[PDB]
Amino acid sequence: MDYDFKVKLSSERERVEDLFEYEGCKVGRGTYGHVYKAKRKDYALKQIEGTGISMSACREIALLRELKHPNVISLQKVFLSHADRKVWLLFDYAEHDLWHIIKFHRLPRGMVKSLLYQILDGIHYLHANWVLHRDLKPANILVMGEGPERGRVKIADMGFARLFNSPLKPLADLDPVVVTFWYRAPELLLGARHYTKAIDIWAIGCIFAELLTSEPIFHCHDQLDRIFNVMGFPADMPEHSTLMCSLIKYMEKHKVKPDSKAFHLLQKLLTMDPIKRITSEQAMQDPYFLEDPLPTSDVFAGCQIPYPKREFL
């Protein structure tokens, strides 16, 4: 570890502040880090919380290095500053976040049809590469706008994503909490320590119901009561006794027809057991997408976007 190697590396390196106007105009704040709009001297520049590299940063870097897909976010470059020992990532800018669409409408059917189809194919591709997202929220789904590609939802912010190819330790021994309680699957909420890949299916079903009713289906034992209320109690894994019809009426209250094609898929997406839950590939085979309107690559399909651009903080 000598001076000449350091000076040569510094000469080879390029400074992030010397190339991008990341200062100011912060566009997103969260527990993952800070997201800014940046341009060369538009991209989303993300600074990760915490000095040095943490488990989230290491997983992020080791996962999006080798994953490539039209429906999956892809970083273009990474910067590593030694003065303060923190990490900077550079994704392509995604103007519209699904949370913004949900909030603005509080709605074409083909739009939600295509959006669900695209998220299902993306999560199927993710499951193909033998990895678990372990976090699906409406704020983690981003939509391109008025660019070279329209629509084309992108899954991102997979800091909690972990490979499940072969577990050296149980998946719950190093992460008691994997996702927010609004979308926690019943299996892990019942204290399961080894959970399969079906949790993401439950999450996508929950968010699909949220877009169907334009209102959070699950709102706040804090969520177990709501889970039992929304779709009844299972009368047909651990702490079974320690815990101490409704779905149809709940969907009817939101002016959704009980007898339709979307309702059957939504009902079959959410089950109390992992074995009977459908996997990603069978979701596309559901003739729900087949019925008109057929899913589109462009969600807007030529319509003007009424949602405003993301605002600064």
């Binding site: 490539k68 189809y117 596309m284 997408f289 399909a301």
Partner: peptide, 16 residues
């Protein structure tokens, strides 16, 4: 933007 036959099969990916 209509793809009748493409609905059944998922996209393989960007690949190389």
């Amino acid at each position: 933007t209509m793809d009748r036959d493409k609905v059944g099969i998922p996209t393989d990916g960007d690949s190389h």
